[PDB]
Amino acid sequence: SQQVDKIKASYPLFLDQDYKDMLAKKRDGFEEKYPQDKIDEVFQWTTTKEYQELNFQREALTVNPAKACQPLGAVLCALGFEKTMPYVHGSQGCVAYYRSYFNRHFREPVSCVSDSMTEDAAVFGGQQNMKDGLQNCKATYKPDMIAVSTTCMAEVIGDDLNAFINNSKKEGFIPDEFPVPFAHTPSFVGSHVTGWDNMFEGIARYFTLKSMDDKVVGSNKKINIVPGFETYLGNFRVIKRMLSEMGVGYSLLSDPEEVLDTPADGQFRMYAGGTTQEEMKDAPNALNTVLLQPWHLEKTKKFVEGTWKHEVPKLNIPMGLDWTDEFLMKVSEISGQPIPASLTKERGRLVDMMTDSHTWLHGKRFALWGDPDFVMGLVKFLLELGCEPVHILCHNGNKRWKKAVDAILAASPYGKNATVYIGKDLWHLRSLVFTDKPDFMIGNSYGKFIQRDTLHKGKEFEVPLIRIGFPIFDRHHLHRSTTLGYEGAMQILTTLVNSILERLDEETRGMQATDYNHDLVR
C-alpha cells in the first residue's frame, strides 16, 4: 500500500508487515533455505582465523577483485587527447561496460566505440571490421584522431592492429594523414593500469618515433608530465596549478580534465580540451619527462628514455608531505625556477593542520587498497600522520613494489604492525579486518560490503569505510576531489580526522550511557 503524500521507495516499503509476511511465506514455502542457526554458524566461521587460513590458500578462485582489465585504462588514456575517439578493436560488450563504469564514477558522458567483431571475425579476423569501423567512426563522430586498443577476443585470435590499420589507409577507408595510434591491450595481462601505459606509449611512438632527427633535448624549455591512470579531476588540476605557480613551462600528456567535466549549458560536447597533437610531436624537445605514477608507466619510461633520450627523475608519486617536497625540488632543479612563496606557505599550512589534528590521528589503524602508486603514497602519508597502515592490499602489485613499500614501512615506527599483500582480493581483506581489526578502511565503494559484514558480527566489530580511490559509485562528486600535492594531503587529512570524530560522536551519543564524552569541543 501507499499513502500519496508520503510515498515509500523499496526502503522502507518492503518493511511493511504485509510485505514482510509475504517474503516469509516465499522463503518457507519454496526457497528451501538453510535454517537461520546454520546461517549464523557459517557466518561466524567466516570471521575466524581458521577460515582466513583456508581463504589465503586459494590458488584458482578470485572473489571480489580490486582491479579491472587493460582496455579500461587505454580508454581513459585516449580520452586525454584533443578531439580523440577511443576505439577498442574487438567485441562490443566490452565497450558498453567501460563506458558505464566510467559513467558511474564521473557522472559524465564517456565516448568510446567498438567495431563489433562477432562469431564471423573470430575465425577469419577482424580486418573488415577495422576498415568499416574507422571509416564509420571518422565520418559520424568527426574525431581528429582515433586511438585503437583491443578486447581479449581480438588478442586471442591474433589480429595484427598495425597491419589492419595500414590496410585501412591503403584501401582508402581513412586518409593516410589521419592519426590512428594503437596498442595491444590483452585483459589477461596486468590490469587496467597496464592498458594506460600501453596506450600512452603507443601514442608517443606514433607522433615521435620517425621524427627524432630534428629534436634537441631541452630546446623548448618545458617539462613533460605523464599522469597515468587518474580518476580525480583535482589531481590533474593541482599539478597544472603548482607548475603554473612556479612559472614552470610544462606539457601535460594525456589531459582529460575538461572532457570529464563539461558544463551543463544546453549543449552536449563529445570532446573538450585535451593534449594536442602538436604537444605530443614536440615533447622530445622538452628538458625532461616526469612520471607521476611510475609503477605503472614502465613501458612509457623505456620509450621516453630510449627514444627521446630524457633522463626520467627517480620520483615517487607526489602524495603526502615528503614526496610533494621532493617533486617540487626536482622540478625546480630541472627547470631552474625557484619554489615560490605561495607553495612554501601552502606546505606550512598543511604542516599546521598536521599539528592541529595529530592527537586524534595518532595510532589509528587502517586497512587500504587501490593501485600501486596511489597505495604507496597513501601509506607514506599515513606514516607522516602518525597512523598505522596495518593491512595494505594491492591486487595488481608486484614483488619489486611490495619490497619498496616494505622499506618505507621499516623506516618508521608506525610501520611496525603493517603487512603488504599483493595478488590478494577484497575477500582476503575481509578476513583481515575480522581477525586483526583496524579502526577504518580507506578504499573504493566495494568496501561498503566489508563494512556491512563487520557490523553483522557486532557494532563493536564494525569497520567504517572512508571512500578514497576508484571506483566511487555510492557518493556524489567525490571525483572532483584531490589526493596529490599539499592540497590533496590537506583533503585526505581532513577526511580522516573527521571520519574519526564522526565515529566517536556516534559511540558517545547514547544519553546517560556514553554521552559523558559527547564533547562540544574536540
Partner: protein, 477 residues
C-alpha cells in the same frame, strides 16, 4: 510531429554515414502507421551492429550472467575468463534479493577465474576444477554453481561441459556450464536464449520424477521479472492477494529450488517475453503448462492483467481479483489526481533493451503523457509487432539506435523527457532535457504494480518539473 517531418528527419540524419552504413541503418528506422501491422513489413531487427557507430548494446555474457543467472541468489556464478567482465558487472543491476550475502546468498559478489596468459596458453579447465573445490571449501552453503563463459573460453578450445559433468558428479552438486561468450550473437539477446537452454538442460528437470510437492489449483510462476528495485515483490503481493500461490520468481530474488519447482505449477505468468519466452515454450511443450503475457506497468495495465490472469481460474479467484482492484483503487486514483496535472501533455522518448520500450507506455498514458519515440537495443520482430499496438500513429521507432542518431533525433523532436540508460543519461541532461533511467529506475522504484506506480509518478514529476532545468542558460548569455 508529422510523418513527412519524421521521414525527412531520418533521411537528414543518415546523410552523415558512409554508403554501406547509410543503407543498413535506414532499415532499422521507421515511422509507424496503424495501417501496417506486420513489423516485418517496416523495420529490421536483431541484426549485427555496424562497426564504429557507438551502439548502446552489450554482449551475450551480459544477457546470460548479468540478466538471467546473476540474480539467482543461493547459487554461485563464476565469471570464467579474464577479470574485466565480472568487475564491470558487479552489482550494477539492481536485481533485489533477501539473503545473508557471502554465506547463503552471493548475488552482489564477483567470483572469477581471473585468467592470466598461462590460462590462455594451457587452457582453463584445470583451473576451473580447482576453483570449484575452493568454492566448496569457502562457501559451503551454496546450492549450485554456474560457469559464465567469457570471450576466450570458446576461442581457446576449453571444455567447461566436461568439467561441470565430472565435478558435479564427484561433488553431487548442480554445476551449470553456460556458453555465453561475448562474441556470440549480436547483443544481450542471444545470452538470454543460451541461458534459458542452460536452465532447461542442467536444472529444470531435476524433480521430474518427484511427487512430494503439495500442489494447488492456484499455483503460478512469475516468469521474466528480475525484481529491479523490488519490482517482483510489488507484483507478487498482488497475485497472492488475488488468491494465487506464487511458487517461483524467474529470477529476481529467485532460489534454485524455486526454479526446480516451476514445472509443477498451473500457469506461467510471463512479464519479460524477450528474455524468457524460450523456457516458457519449453515448459508448455514438455510439461503442458500454459503461459501468458501480462503487464504490471501502471493501473490500467495492472488491472487488465489481474483480470486476464484471474479469468484462467475459477470464480473464487475472479472475486478476489475485484477485491484487490477495489482495495487499491483509491490509492492509485490519489496518485493520478496529484501527478497527472503536473505531467499531462508532456512528450517522452524512450530507448531501452527488450521489453520496457513498449511495456511502460500505458503507465505514461495513465499520467497524461505521450510517448513520441521508442526503440530497443536488441528486440526481435515479434517485439516490434507488439510495439505497433502500443505506440501512437506516426511515432518514431529506432532499432539498435546509434549515439549520433539518438542525439540528432532528440535535437529535432525536443521531447520533454527521455527515458534510457546510464550511457545516455548525462548526454541529455547537459542538453537541458530531463532524464530518467529506465533500466535502474535511477536507484528508485519499484515501478511494478500499484505500489510501483506511486513511485513511478513521483519520479517522473520530480525530474520533469525540477527547478534545475530552467538554469542552464546564464542570464548574460
Amino acid at each position: 510531429m508529422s510523418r513527412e517531418e519524421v521521414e525527412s528527419l531520418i533521411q537528414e540524419v543518415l546523410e552523415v554515414y558512409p554508403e554501406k552504413a547509410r543503407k543498413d541503418r535506414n532499415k532499422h528506422l521507421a515511422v509507424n502507421d496503424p495501417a501496417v501491422t506486420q513489423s516485418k513489413k517496416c523495420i529490421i531487427s536483431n541484426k549485427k551492429s555496424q562497426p564504429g557507430l557507438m551502439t548502446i548494446r552489450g554482449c551475450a555474457y551480459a544477457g546470460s550472467k548479468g540478466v538471467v543467472w546473476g540474480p539467482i541468489k543461493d547459487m554461485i556464478h563464476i565469471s570464467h575468463g579474464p577479470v574485466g567482465c565480472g568487475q564491470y558487472s558487479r552489482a550494477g543491476r539492481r536485481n533485489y534479493y533477501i539473503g545473508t550475502t557471502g554465506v547463503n546468498a552471493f548475488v552482489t559478489m564477483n567470483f572469477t577465474s581471473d585468467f592470466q596468459e598461462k590460462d590462455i596458453v594451457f587452457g582453463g579447465d584445470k583451473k576451473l576444477a580447482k576453483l570449484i573445490d575452493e568454492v566448496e571449501t569457502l562457501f559451503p552453503l551454496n546450492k549450485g554453481i554456474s560457469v559464465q563463459s567469457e570471450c576466450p573460453i570458446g576461442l581457446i578450445g576449453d571444455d567447461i561441459e566436461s568439467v561441470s559433468k565430472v565435478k558435479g558428479a564427484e561433488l553431487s552438486k548442480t554445476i551449470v556450464p553456460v556458453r555465453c561468450e561475448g562474441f556470440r550473437g549480436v547483443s544481450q539477446s542471444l545470452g538470454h536464449h543460451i541461458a534459458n537452454d542452460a536452465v532447461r538442460d542442467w536444472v529444470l528437470g531435476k524433480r521430474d520424477e518427484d511427487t512430494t510437492f503439495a500442489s494447488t489449483p492456484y499455483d503460478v510462476a512469475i516468469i521474466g521479472d528480475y525484481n529491479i528495485g523490488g519490482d517482483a515483490w510489488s507484483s507478487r503481493i498482488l497475485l497472492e492477494e488475488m488468491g494465487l500461490r506464487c511458487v517461483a520468481q524467474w529470477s529476481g530474488d529467485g532460489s534454485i529450488s524455486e526454479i526446480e519447482l516451476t514445472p509443477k505449477v498451473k500457469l506461467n505468468l510471463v512479464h519479460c517475453y524477450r528474455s524468457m519466452n524460450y523456457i516458457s515454450r519449453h515448459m508448455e511443450e514438455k510439461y503442458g503448462i500454459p503461459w501468458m503475457e501480462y503487464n504490471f506497468f501502471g493501473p490500467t495495465k495492472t488491472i487488465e492483467s489481474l483480470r486476464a490472469i484471474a479469468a484462467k481460474f475459477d470464480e473464487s479467484i475472479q472475486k478476489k481479483c475485484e477485491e484487490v482492484i477495489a482495495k487499491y483503487k483509491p490509492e492509485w486514483e490519489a496518485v493520478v489526481a496529484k501527478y497527472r496535472p503536473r505531467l499531462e501533455g508532456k512528450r517522452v522518448m524512450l530507448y531501452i533493451g527488450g521489453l520496457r520500450p513498449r511495456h511502460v507506455i500505458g503507465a505514461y498514458e495513465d499520467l497524461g503523457m505521450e510517448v513520441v519515440g521508442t526503440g530497443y537495443e536488441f528486440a526481435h520482430n515479434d517485439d516490434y509487432d507488439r510495439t505497433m499496438k502500443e505506440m501512437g500513429d506516426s511515432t518514431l521507432l529506432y532499432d539498435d539506435v546509434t549515439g549520433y542518431e539518438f542525439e540528432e533525433f532528440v535535437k529535432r523532436i525536443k521531447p520533454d523527457l527521455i527515458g534510457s540508460g546510464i550511457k545516455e543519461k548525462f548526454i541529455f541532461q547537459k542538453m537541458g532535457i530531463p532524464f530518467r533511467e529506465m533500466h535502474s529506475w535511477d536507484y528508485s522504484g519499484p515501478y511494478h504494480g500499484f505500489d510501483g506506480f506511486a513511485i513511478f509518478a513521483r519520479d517522473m514529476d520530480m525530474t520533469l518539473n525540477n527547478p534545475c532545468w530552467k538554469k542552464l542558460q546564464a542570464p548574460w548569455e
